[PDB]
Design a binder for this molecule. Structure first.
Ligand code: YHN
Length: 234
């Protein structure tokens, strides 16, 4: 992810098949002549899409130009959460499945994994960051405190941002409860709040056509909402 002051990000396509699949996802959802009610509603929850982009002198080098969801914030607090029970897709080999489950074997039980967070601390005027090892170290005993950390600014728990996050996730959940045409593996929610609220879906290299409800995604969203709700009682 490269941030541009124009308020966009350039996301370099991942190696095939992942990068091309992400491109096709955006192209399908944002098809100008698309009138599919499901997909028009989905647009609300994605970064705005500005098309494929490559450097003037390098047509080989493919990027997606996307809305920078963090741009409108002064001190954005950012958390990336992978959603679902499975972070491998329906075409994964035994070996790849094992690779993916190995990365976080609690995915089936918890239904989400914190990929990272960056939290503005008011008292020190500084950011505290967690990397991928943080979320992969969380268990059923520790997930609630693990998520809470995102919303702690050094002096208070930001229950306002927690509640707003629940309200925004609930709309995404409603979208998922009302579509049976796409299943999403290894995709994420990006949470952003002002540390001095956004909740958007990102990372679409493993989105596949389906004829059923995305039950792993729904389980994950519901578990995540339940955790957030519990935090409101702290
Ligand atoms: C600073 C920062 C960190 C992090 C972790 C994410 C983003 C981010 O802001 N707008 C985005 C749109 C799409 C994607 C994406 O990955 O597709 C990422 C975005 C920005």
């Amino acid at each position: 992810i490269l941030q541009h002051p124009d308020g966009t990000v350039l996301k370099q396509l991942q190696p095939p098949p992942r990068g091309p699949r992400e491109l096709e996802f955006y192209n399908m959802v944002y098809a100008a002549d698309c009138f599919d009610g499901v997909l028009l509603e989905l647009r609300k929850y994605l970064p705005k899409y500005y098309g494929i982009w490559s450097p003037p002198t390098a047509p080989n080098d493919l990027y997606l130009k996307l809305e920078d969801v963090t741009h409108k914030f002064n001190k954005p607090c950012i958390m990336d959460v992978k959603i679902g029970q499975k972070s491998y897709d329906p075409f994964a080999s035994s070996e790849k499945i094992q690779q993916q489950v190995s990365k976080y074997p609690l995915m089936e039980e918890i239904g989400f994994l914190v990929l990272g967070m960056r939290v503005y601390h008011v008292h020190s005027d500084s950011y505290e960051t967690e990397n991928q090892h943080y979320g992969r170290s969380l268990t059923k005993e520790t997930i609630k405190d693990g998520v809470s950390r995102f919303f702690h600014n050094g002096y208070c728990l930001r229950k306002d941002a927690v509640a707003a996050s629940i309200q925004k996730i609930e709309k995404i959940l409603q979208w998922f409860e009302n579509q049976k045409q796409l299943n999403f593996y290894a995709s994420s929610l990006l949470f952003v709040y002002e540390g001095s609220v956004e909740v958007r879906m990102i990372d679409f290299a493993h989105v596949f056509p389906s004829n059923t409800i995305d039950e792993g995604y729904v389980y994950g969203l519901k578990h995540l909402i339940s955790v957030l709700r519990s935090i409101l009682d702290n």
